[PDB]
Amino acid sequence: MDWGTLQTILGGVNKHSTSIGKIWLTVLFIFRIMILVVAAKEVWGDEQADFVCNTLQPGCKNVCYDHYFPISHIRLWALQLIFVSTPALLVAMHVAYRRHEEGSLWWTYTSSIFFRVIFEAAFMYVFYVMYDGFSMQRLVKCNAWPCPNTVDCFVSRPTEKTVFTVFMIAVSGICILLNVTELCYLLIRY
Amino acid sequence: MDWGTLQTILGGVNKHSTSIGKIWLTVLFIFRIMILVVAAKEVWGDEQADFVCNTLQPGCKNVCYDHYFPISHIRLWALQLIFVSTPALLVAMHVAYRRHEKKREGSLWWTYTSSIFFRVIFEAAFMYVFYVMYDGFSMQRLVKCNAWPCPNTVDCFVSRPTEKTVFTVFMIAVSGICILLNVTELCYLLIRY
Numbered sequence: 001m002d003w004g005t006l007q008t009i010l011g012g013v014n015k016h017s018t019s020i021g022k023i024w025l026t027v028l029f030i031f032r033i034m035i036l037v038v039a040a041k042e043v044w045g046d047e048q049a050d051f052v053c054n055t056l057q058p059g060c061k062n063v064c065y066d067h068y069f070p071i072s073h074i075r076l077w078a079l080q081l082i083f084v085s086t087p088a089l090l091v092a093m094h095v096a097y098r099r100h101e102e103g104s105l106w107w108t109y110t111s112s113i114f115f116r117v118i119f120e121a122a123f124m125y126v127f128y129v130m131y132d133g134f135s136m137q138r139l140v141k142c143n144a145w146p147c148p149n150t151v152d153c154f155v156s157r158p159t160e161k162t163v164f165t166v167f168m169i170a171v172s173g174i175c176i177l178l179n180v181t182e183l184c185y186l187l188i189r190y
Numbered sequence: 191m192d193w194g195t196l197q198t199i200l201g202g203v204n205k206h207s208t209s210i211g212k213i214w215l216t217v218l219f220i221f222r223i224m225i226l227v228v229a230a231k232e233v234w235g236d237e238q239a240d241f242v243c244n245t246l247q248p249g250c251k252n253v254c255y256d257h258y259f260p261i262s263h264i265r266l267w268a269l270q271l272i273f274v275s276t277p278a279l280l281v282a283m284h285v286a287y288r289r290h291e292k293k294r295e296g297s298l299w300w301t302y303t304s305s306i307f308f309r310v311i312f313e314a315a316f317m318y319v320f321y322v323m324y325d326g327f328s329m330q331r332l333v334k335c336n337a338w339p340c341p342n343t344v345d346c347f348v349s350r351p352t353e354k355t356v357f358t359v360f361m362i363a364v365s366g367i368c369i370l371l372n373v374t375e376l377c378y379l380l381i382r383y
Contacts, residue, residue, distance in 0.1 A: 048349075
């Protein structure tokens with residue numbers, strides 16, 4: 001995809017936030033989006049076109065690809081970004097509700113931060129359990145029907161996909177830490 | 191082609207509506223659009239390029255694909271969003287000139303309950319069509335096809351059945367929620383009689 005105007009939306013959402021919340025989470029957020037669109041989205045461009053299986057059985061390539069990649073990484077990251085951005089924007093709408101006509105504003109703001117840490121941890125769990133670590137393999141062995149006994153299939157761009165996987169996981173771990181420290185920073189204020 | 195000056199379009203439309211309808215319906219509504227355009231629309235990119243049938247007959251692939259997918263999933267969701275969007279739009283437009291003229295009321299409650307009423311119809315109808323026409327929300331790896339010109343019976347294999355199931359389940363769930371949100375409006379709206 002592409003974009004036409006993201007500076008206006010970031011400027012408005014910038015206001016009414018804490019020191020680190022104003023900058024650090026925001027710059028890390030646009031950091032992840034930039035990585036996703038300009039670079040990574042076309043590494044996974046031919047994930048199925050260049051999948052190769054050493055067999056003559058028709059339909060074996062379809063099932064073996066689907067058995068090992070139930071959902072591709074880039075569409076896992078796209079889902080994650082949407083989930084961890086909605087609490088940011090709806091609170092911008094809840095205040096717009098009260099504008100048309102302090103505990104409430106405080107209660108909402110502290111609640112959103114509790115959600116963001118939840119979603120990121122949940123999604124990082126899915127990568128680990130689904131893909132068995134963060135390293136992708138050149139060779140996969142598949143024996144689902146209709147494939148005969150056991151078939152060798154070869155992945156496209158295994159090394160580059162590993163690099164971006166490590167990169168997206170790292171900045172997600174940072175965002176979790178930033179949320180936790182900022183959260184406990186408010187708790188002492190009570 | 192991609193998103194344009196929707197922020198002003200949405201900025202205009204959110205004003206002058208009920209509290210949860212102010213945000214929750216709209217937020218869930220842009221929730222569906224993002225999934226449709228950002229992620230889902232390229233899962234279905236090679237639906238027919240990667241259909242594979244175990245046969246040597248010319249034209250068996252065309253008839254078998256057309257028989258099991260009379261209309262693609264992403265085209266139904268696009269249609270559904272258009273239909274549910276319109277009643278929100280026009281009624282939001284209808285109030286504009288009066289607010290314009292007032293600076294220069296039981297009727298609208300008939301209109302407002304009408305638009306709320308219509309949305310639930312379109313949500314229910316489209317969720318109904320998925321069930322009857324695709325035989326549940328789960329997509330299978332293997333389809334057996336015996337339409338002419340195919341010989342006796344042919345095995346054909348779908349592309350990305352597991353990923354298409356995940357998004358199908360997701361779109362149905364958020365569609366089900368919007369129905370629940372809508373009916374709450376009428377209960378708050380009818381309780382005043």
